[PDB]
Subunit: 120 residues, 2 copies
């Protein structure tokens, strides 16, 4: 299982929307249920690997997770097509940090990091 | 029911001698909103290398993938015959010194997620 988006740094201004890409391709043995998660490790605290969004069992859980609640959502209307990307709206300085996309389609697994910086 | 998906004793150390079998416990309790498909994964971060978070076993879509993952292939398996009952424990047979490291049990039953860490020590 591969995430074809490279690790990169996204820099946007406060108040704008950040698109954090995560596109993936599957290998032949990846026959299990698709599961996608993003995690944040914020620059403003010592917390790491906090879940911000999850697709599992063909359902999306977004605002359920408190970090970035109301502001992080999947961008695609068809995640199964290979697009696990997210948008973070109304960017705040507290959103700065490392975001990790995790894609699983059993037994395959892949992960990729995107760095986000927000400018005043 | 717990308030949120929980694992009993989320951080501990297990010690066993070389050649023996280690039992790594991971017993979980669901909360009422945990209604998605059960998914369980274990990872290893070996003391003897820079690699971290390497998958060693997975239960997903009601199937177990164990030897599929190269780390500890042939030697790591789930111990229970009923994972859905709350038992995500694994065992590692014929322990080698190279097995020393941090093992993470991750349990998901969407939207709930919980993790446990076990430091495994193998004695000569």
């Amino acid at each position: 299982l591969s995430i074809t988006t490279p690790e990169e740094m996204i820099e946007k201004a406060k108040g704008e929307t950040a698109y954090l890409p995560c596109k993936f391709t599957l290998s032949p043995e990846d026959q299990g249920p698709l599961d996608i998660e993003w995690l944040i490790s914020p620059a403003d605290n010592q917390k790491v690997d906090q879940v911000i969004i999850l697709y599992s069992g063909d359902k999306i859980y977004d605002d359920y997770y408190p970090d970035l609640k109301g502001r992080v959502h999947f961008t695609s209307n068809d995640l199964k097509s290979g697009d696990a990307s997210i948008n973070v709206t109304n960017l705040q300085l507290s959103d700065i940090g490392t975001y990790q996309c995790k894609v699983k389609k059993a037994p395959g697994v892949a992960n990729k990091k995107i760095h986000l910086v927000v400018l005043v």
